[PDB]
Design a binder for these strands. Structure first.
Ligand SMILES: [Mg+2]
Ligand SMILES: [Mg+2]
Ligand SMILES: [Mg+2]
Ligand SMILES: [Mg+2]
Ligand SMILES: [Mg+2]
Ligand SMILES: [Mg+2]
Ligand SMILES: [Mg+2]
Ligand SMILES: [Mg+2]
Ligand SMILES: [Mg+2]
Ligand SMILES: [Mg+2]
Ligand SMILES: [Mg+2]
Ligand SMILES: [Mg+2]
Ligand SMILES: [Mg+2]
Ligand SMILES: [Mg+2]
Ligand SMILES: [Mg+2]
Ligand SMILES: [Mg+2]
Ligand SMILES: [Mg+2]
Ligand SMILES: [Mg+2]
Ligand SMILES: [Mg+2]
Ligand SMILES: [Mg+2]
Ligand SMILES: [Mg+2]
Ligand SMILES: [Mg+2]
Ligand SMILES: [Mg+2]
Ligand SMILES: [Mg+2]
Ligand SMILES: [Mg+2]
Ligand SMILES: [Mg+2]
Ligand SMILES: [Mg+2]
Ligand SMILES: [Mg+2]
Ligand SMILES: [Mg+2]
Ligand SMILES: [Mg+2]
Ligand SMILES: [Mg+2]
Ligand SMILES: [Mg+2]
Ligand SMILES: [Mg+2]
Ligand SMILES: [Mg+2]
Ligand SMILES: [Mg+2]
Ligand SMILES: [Mg+2]
Ligand SMILES: [Mg+2]
Ligand SMILES: [Mg+2]
Ligand SMILES: [Mg+2]
Ligand SMILES: [Mg+2]
Ligand SMILES: [Mg+2]
Ligand SMILES: [Mg+2]
Ligand SMILES: [Mg+2]
Ligand SMILES: [Mg+2]
Ligand SMILES: [Mg+2]
Ligand SMILES: [Mg+2]
Ligand SMILES: [Mg+2]
Ligand SMILES: [Mg+2]
Ligand SMILES: [Mg+2]
Ligand SMILES: [Mg+2]
Ligand SMILES: [Mg+2]
Ligand SMILES: [Mg+2]
Ligand SMILES: [Mg+2]
Ligand SMILES: [Mg+2]
Ligand SMILES: [Mg+2]
Ligand SMILES: [Mg+2]
Ligand SMILES: [Mg+2]
Ligand SMILES: [Mg+2]
Ligand SMILES: [Mg+2]
Ligand SMILES: [Mg+2]
Ligand SMILES: [Mg+2]
Ligand SMILES: [Mg+2]
Ligand SMILES: [Mg+2]
Ligand SMILES: [Mg+2]
Ligand SMILES: [Mg+2]
Ligand SMILES: [Mg+2]
Ligand SMILES: [Mg+2]
Ligand SMILES: [Mg+2]
Ligand SMILES: [Mg+2]
Lengths: 172, 191, 197, 106, 137
RNA sequence: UUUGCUCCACACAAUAUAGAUGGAUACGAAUAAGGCGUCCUUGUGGCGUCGCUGAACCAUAGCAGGCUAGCAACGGUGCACUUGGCGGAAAGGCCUUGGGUGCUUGCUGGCGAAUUGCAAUGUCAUUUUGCGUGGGGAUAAAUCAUUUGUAUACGACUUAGA
RNA sequence: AGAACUGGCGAUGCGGGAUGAACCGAACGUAGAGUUAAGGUGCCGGAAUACACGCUCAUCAGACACCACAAAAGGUGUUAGUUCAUCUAGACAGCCGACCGGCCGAAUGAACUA
RNA sequence: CUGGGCCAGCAUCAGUUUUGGUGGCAGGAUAAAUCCAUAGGAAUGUAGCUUGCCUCGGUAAGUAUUAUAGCCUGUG
């Protein structure tokens, strides 16, 4: 929950004399390190099957790099989150060059406008938007148009000397 | 959500000049010349040709974008007024006491005078705003047309007159006495 | 660096100009602020007005004469914000405030002196566009500052003489670069640019 | 010539302190041109001198000098800590100090 | 006149093939080009000739230059490096006062003490010529 | 009424310093815009150019900056006068003439420096005040006591007296 | 007002909470140097007017545990989100000859959540 | 002129420490990417081509999958 990584985390119930070879289960977990991701895993699995971490074991944990990290993508993001008075589901769209960068900006948005801290957010699904025109949210659509050019008016240049000898300009 | 570009256009009819620098708009036309100071809005004017100007707002919010269109409307009315011009008409409506309206001047002033309103002995006086002209009508009873190239000056100068007789202390539903704006229109291109 | 720094108050932001001036003094920098009436405050005139009236509200009940003193002029409206950021009830702070001067308009010694600007206190650089901001002198006059027009009247007059001064100054820098022509192509020229001048 | 200065200009800002308690045994110094602790590492170890005047004479002169060395770096803005043989008078806050070029590792 | 004049402040645009100067980074000081847009802040830059990798940069750490060159949206590093040099952006850049000044100061800050000396000996000589030829016409 | 008074000159001893050490280096205005060069029916005008920091500009070499001989400049700069203007926001400063004189590293020569011994030591600034000398200029009041009542608890107030 | 368990105050300074018996941090011979805790780093005031994404304009905005209060109920302020209905079998606004048609060419209507 | 005592600088070390530059290694999808090769595909559809434009400068429609721009996806 700092600067984000994706992990394939594979774990299983402990084997018993009754049942050797219990089924492996995999989750993709967005976390800041392996200790959180491993812990994050058991959090959801205890929300799904009957397992504790005490009763189970983790088979593998592996980082997942973006396959096309310099390729701009449009992402669908499905989020469940508790709010102050209730817990609800959301679809958001994020345009970025990886899933990590997109989850990185996902949690900020859920913090900024919904006041939702990490602990109160589940990421249900994050997938790439296959085509354009399947893009729903309009704040992404603006940057999908053909031959897209815009200015950046009112340039403010950080100074260094604390006194400056001319009236500055913003002209860019 | 901060839209990245939104713009509107301003029709510039044949034989009208529009000079806009440092967001100070000048509009020269057949009727005269009008200016406006738009410095109080961030907006960007582009002149596409002598008949067309665009007003753009880059990466605007909902409230910023709202100011865009009204810039266009403000320049537009500046244009239509320097060409067609504006004409505002009013009607004295009085149930008993005739509302006595004239034009009077004090030290090169020219105020509109209002006498006998609702039986008053007081004399109401509204200054005639600069550049707006007052003429009473021959063929309609109780008219006093107000006309000029600025909607804003003609409309207010009308409403200065309209308000100065408001019937205080009586039921307004019953006492409808006053001078109300009957018709809004143009000087030329009919009316 | 420099013995004294003249700051043009115009188009700056009160609290941020105060903050940078205070440290200067505490660090030994002599300062003078000019055109304090063209200084700005964030927030629209009504707000920063009402804000003043709260300040105006407070006075020592039994004697208004010992109560908080409400100074109207912009330079003083500024000095309060500054003196509030200096520890002024001690000897150090007293000394530091002695290093500061503030004037509305720009009076004779400083009128011919070079004036600087403090970018992080500057309004246009700092405030987001569309945010409303008050002009100090106009607010200062609404609370009873009596000198606004005179300051403006003399400011307009000064701006004339400064214009003409600049007219001569520029025309000379013309005649300096005019006669600089032949040396711009000279051999000592190429000599100098080789080393960067 | 017209300028004889072999030192970098400086300023005595404060003692080392927490919010409510100071430590005269160390002084914080602002150096001209030094905006980052990167830059201030160059002046680490250098000799500083506070120069002041008096009434009585030492040898033929009413001028005296307090000596100290730049010790470590202070914060992100290029301030420097320093320690003088005797602590600086604390009236000295906001007074010029002189940071020399020796000992030199250039 | 009746020409209906309007002053439209002309901005450097975020667009594809805007060449752009990195302020902060290991890539700082280098030029680079905008391959694609992400949002109002992030863009996708490739610096191939100057050494700048392909990457998402915030528009803050970059300063738009006046220079543009034709580039298709999303071009991979290879074709960026082609149309770049095919457009001679590096050659246009260095011809600018902007570029030329960044060089000029670097030279100055590279000067040694003896070179600092020589500059004054030359400047005094250039000073004599000028102050004499000022007092001409 | 013992020594007075003030101004100027450069002269010794005291006196204090919120802190000299190349230089505080003057348009106005705008920032969703401007600066400068240029052009001219002088304009909300045309063309060109710049920004992206003063990382500038000016200054800067010579025993703390000595001695001496020249070349090329007709310039640069200091100081002591001199002619005019402009400056009232706290103008007490700014521009200017005129000569005189000192230096000049723009350039070419001839001499000196040490041992202050491997850093501690260093240029003397800048405020008040007292002795002094050299000339310039000026020659009062006020309080007390008395006195008035337009004043007054006492002071204070307000009048009057060569 | 009165019990349980532990930790404390009392009997204890120190750093933090401006202020403070009990909170946070840490408990104390005399000292030097280093590093930190809790808490902070515009200025008072030691420490980035640091970097980053958003939100917020309040005619008492807000600003950090204990802590020095505010509730139900409203808001066509603005922000994100949900649901249902309509829409390329071309709707919804708009101009053109209730309803229909031509042009347009991608959204629209309502109820909601925080 | 030399003693001892003191104070200071530098060097060579010792203990605590702080802040740079730099070399060589190991793991991972034996990083993922660029890059290269191979198969395919699409559109925020590049070159062409019919359509009417044409002040033949513009041409927006229909086609049109690399052509006179490129991109995406698989494999290696
Ligand atoms: Mg790990
Ligand atoms: Mg189950
Ligand atoms: Mg789902
Ligand atoms: Mg619920
Ligand atoms: Mg969906
Ligand atoms: Mg969003
Ligand atoms: Mg939950
Ligand atoms: Mg800067
Ligand atoms: Mg500057
Ligand atoms: Mg300035
Ligand atoms: Mg009006
Ligand atoms: Mg009644
Ligand atoms: Mg009533
Ligand atoms: Mg206030
Ligand atoms: Mg006090
Ligand atoms: Mg003053
Ligand atoms: Mg008063
Ligand atoms: Mg009052
Ligand atoms: Mg000590
Ligand atoms: Mg001690
Ligand atoms: Mg040592
Ligand atoms: Mg001692
Ligand atoms: Mg000691
Ligand atoms: Mg964004
Ligand atoms: Mg005497
Ligand atoms: Mg004293
Ligand atoms: Mg002009
Ligand atoms: Mg220009
Ligand atoms: Mg300059
Ligand atoms: Mg000579
Ligand atoms: Mg001469
Ligand atoms: Mg001379
Ligand atoms: Mg002279
Ligand atoms: Mg003064
Ligand atoms: Mg004078
Ligand atoms: Mg005088
Ligand atoms: Mg002369
Ligand atoms: Mg009596
Ligand atoms: Mg009496
Ligand atoms: Mg009496
Ligand atoms: Mg109890
Ligand atoms: Mg219990
Ligand atoms: Mg406890
Ligand atoms: Mg105890
Ligand atoms: Mg305790
Ligand atoms: Mg305490
Ligand atoms: Mg508290
Ligand atoms: Mg405490
Ligand atoms: Mg606890
Ligand atoms: Mg304070
Ligand atoms: Mg600080
Ligand atoms: Mg906190
Ligand atoms: Mg509270
Ligand atoms: Mg209470
Ligand atoms: Mg509330
Ligand atoms: Mg509520
Ligand atoms: Mg709401
Ligand atoms: Mg509603
Ligand atoms: Mg809504
Ligand atoms: Mg649909
Ligand atoms: Mg609509
Ligand atoms: Mg809807
Ligand atoms: Mg060691
Ligand atoms: Mg490898
Ligand atoms: Mg091949
Ligand atoms: Mg085609
Ligand atoms: Mg091919
Ligand atoms: Mg493409
Ligand atoms: Mg591969």
């Amino acid at each position: 929950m700092a600067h984000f990584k994706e992990y394939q985390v594979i774990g299983r119930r402990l084997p018993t004399e009754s049942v050797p070879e219990p089924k492996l289960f995999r989750m993709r977990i967005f976390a800041s390190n392996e200790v959180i991701a491993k812990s994050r895993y058991w959090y959801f699995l205890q929300k799904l099957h009957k397992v504790k971490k005490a009763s189970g074991e983790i088979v593998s944990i592996n980082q997942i790099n973006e396959a096309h990290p310099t390729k701009v993508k449009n992402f669908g993001v499905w989020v469940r989150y508790d709010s102050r008075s209730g817990t609800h589901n959301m679809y958001k769209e994020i345009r970025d060059v990886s899933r990590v960068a997109a989850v990185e900006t996902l949690y900020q948005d859920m913090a900024a406008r919904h006041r939702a801290r990490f602990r109160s957010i589940h990421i249900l699904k994050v997938a790439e938007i296959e085509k354009t025109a399947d893009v729903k949210r309009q704040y992404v659509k603006q940057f999908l148009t053909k031959d897209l050019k815009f200015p950046l008016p009112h340039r403010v240049q950080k100074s260094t000397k604390t006194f400056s000898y001319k009236r500055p300009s913003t002209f860019y | 959500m901060k839209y990245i570009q939104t713009e509107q256009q301003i029709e510039v009819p044949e034989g009208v000049t529009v000079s806009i620098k440092s967001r100070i708009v000048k509009v020269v036309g057949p009727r005269g010349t009008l200016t406006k100071n738009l410095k109080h809005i961030d907006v960007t004017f582009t002149k596409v040709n002598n008949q067309l100007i665009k007003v753009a707002v880059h990466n605007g919010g909902r409230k910023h974008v709202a100011a865009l269109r009204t810039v266009k409307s403000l320049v537009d009315n500046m244009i239509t007024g320097v060409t067609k011009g504006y004409k505002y008409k009013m009607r004295y409506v009085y149930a008993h006491f005739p509302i006595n309206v004239n034009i009077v001047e004090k030290d090169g002033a020219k105020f509109i005078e209002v006498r006998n309103f609702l039986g008053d002995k007081k004399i109401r006086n509204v200054p005639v705003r600069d550049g707006v002209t007052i003429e009473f009508s021959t063929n309609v009873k109780d008219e006093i047309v107000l006309s000029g190239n600025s909607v804003e000056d003609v409309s207010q100068n009308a409403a200065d007159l309209q308000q100065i007789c408001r019937v205080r202390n009586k039921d307004i539903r019953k006492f409808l006495d006053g001078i109300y704006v009957s018709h809004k229109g143009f000087i030329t291109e009919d009316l | 660096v420099e013995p004294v720094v003249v700051i043009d108050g115009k188009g700056h932001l009160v609290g941020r100009l105060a903050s940078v001036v205070a440290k200067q003094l505490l660090n030994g920098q002599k300062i003078v602020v000019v055109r304090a009436e063209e200084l700005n405050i964030s927030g629209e005139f009504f707000r920063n007005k009402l804000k003043y009236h709260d300040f105006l509200r407070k006075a020592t009940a039994f004697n208004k004469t010992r109560g908080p003193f409400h100074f109207r002029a912009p330079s003083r409206i500024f000095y309060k914000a500054l003196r509030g950021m200096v520890s002024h009830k001690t000897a150090r702070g007293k000394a530091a405030l002695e290093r500061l001067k503030v004037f509305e308009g720009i009076p004779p010694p400083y009128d011919k002196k070079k004036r600087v600007v403090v970018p992080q206190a500057l309004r246009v650089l700092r405030l987001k566009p569309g945010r409303k901001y008050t002009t100090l002198g106009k607010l200062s006059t609404s609370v009873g500052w009596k000198y606004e027009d005179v300051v403006a009247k003399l400011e307009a007059k000064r701006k004339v003489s400064s214009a003409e001064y600049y007219a001569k100054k520029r025309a000379f820098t013309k005649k300096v670069a005019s006669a600089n022509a032949t040396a711009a192509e000279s051999d000592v020229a190429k000599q100098l640019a080789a080393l960067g001048y | 010539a017209e300028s004889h200065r072999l030192y970098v200009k400086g300023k005595h800002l404060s003692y080392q302190r927490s919010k409510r308690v100071n430590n005269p045994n160390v002084s914080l110094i602002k150096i001209e041109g030094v905006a980052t602790p990167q830059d201030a590492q160059f002046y680490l170890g250098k000799r500083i001198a506070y120069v002041y005047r008096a009434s009585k004479e030492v040898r033929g002169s009413k001028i005296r000098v307090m000596w100290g060395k730049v010790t470590r770096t202070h914060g992100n803005s290029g301030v420097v800590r320093a320690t003088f043989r005797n602590n600086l008078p604390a009236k000295t806050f906001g007074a010029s100090v002189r940071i020399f070029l020796y000992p030199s590792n250039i | 006149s009746t020409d209906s004049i309007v002053k439209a402040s002309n901005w450097r645009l975020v667009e594809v093939g805007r060449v752009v100067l990195i302020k902060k980074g290991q890539s700082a000081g280098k030029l680079a080009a905008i391959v694609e847009i992400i949002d109002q802040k992030k863009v996708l830059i490739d610096g191939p000739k100057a050494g700048v990798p392909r990457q998402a940069i915030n528009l803050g750490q970059v300063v738009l230059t006046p220079l543009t060159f034709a580039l298709p949206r999303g071009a991979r590093t290879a074709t960026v490096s082609k149309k770049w040099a095919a457009a001679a952006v590096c050659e246009k850049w260095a011809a600018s006062s902007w570029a030329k000044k960044i060089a000029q100061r670097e030279r100055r800050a590279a000067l040694t003490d003896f070179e600092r000396f020589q500059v004054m000996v030359l400047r005094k000589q250039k000073r004599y010529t000028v102050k004499k030829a000022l007092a001409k016409a």
